[PDB]
């Protein structure tokens with residue numbers, strides 16, 4: 536089981552695609568809901584995502600069919616298409632997924648934020664970094680629901696530098712476009728969802744706290760955080776969850792005026808990557824870094840909850856730390872940071888000490904020596 540949110544609000548979930556093209560926005564929205572009797576949200580909603588996971592693993596296509604049998608009926612605790620909780624302006628997080636992931640795989644984070652009164656737009660990237668994604672060739676294809684699938688691109692060593700940088704830049708543009716879409720829906724613009732779903736987007740009119748915007752993301756998504764901040768000053772702060780820094784161009788490092796929080800796993804990080812994080816540091820800039828003891832790269836993603844403790848540890852989905860323990864630390868330290876740099880009037884400052892890594896399961900800064 537993916538955990539329920541720790542906050543006071545019930546959580547809804549829906550999907551939005553606008554426009555219907557490979558250049559439009561695709562996101563999964565998590566939001567405070569008025570109702571708690573809706574069916575739970577299906578975690579991985581299409582067979583092609585399992586085919587794509589199979590390619591990311593470097594296994595045969597039919598392993599996809601096996602992952603689908605294991606995981607294809609699994610839900611996540613958000614009320615599917617529930618009405619939005621009325622009568623409150625909510626801050627907004629745009630969330631960026633890792634390499635091989637897609638929009639639905641960070642629901643433990645998305646639900647937890649939504650239960651505390653955030654609207655969360657988990658983007659699906661069309662840069663071929665997702666295991667799989669889809670869109671429609673034209674208006675006719677959208678109407679009849681004829682999906683076109685786009686699968687993970689494998690790179691040669693020669694393509695690594697250049698293409699990862701092309702992708703992080705597309706990802707940042709995708710974060711900015713998703714923000715503009717939600718802000719336009721907030722400011723009442725009629726948008727016909729390319730997905731025929733029983734959630735009226737009109738509910739979202741006047742529901743966004745328009746200056747209370749943050750960008751969060753994991754791994755490739757954590758580089759997307761940094762690129763997005765350097766390019767779009769509508770985002771007021773960012774949180775990079777175990778950022779993979781390789782995609783960034785040399786130019787971005789000196790160009791991030793916004794507060795930025797690095798939340799790291801113990802076992803992922805390495806000197807080349809830490810040195811790049813430290814290049815984001817300047818005396819005028821607000822920077823924080825914590826490391827979760829006993830944690831692995833995948834502790835930030837939902838697959839840390841999808842298997843048993845022992846198989847989990849073998850597959851590197853789980854660390855020595857308990858997964859609910861680890862994600863609670865990451866989500867609570869995130870909430871305190873967002874409260875600080877978005878100027879929220881909530882009780883999230885109860886977790887201020889976690890930003891400083893002052894907890895038995897936290898390391899202040901990094902365990903990585905860079906000498």
Ligand SMILES: CN1C(=O)NC(=O)C1(C)C
Nearest residue numbers: 633634753754755756779
């Ligand atoms: C770059 N990556 C990412 O974004 N997620 C992952 O698991 C790896 C490390 C492949």
Ligand SMILES: [Cl-]
Nearest residue numbers: 802803831832
């Ligand atoms: Cl790891």
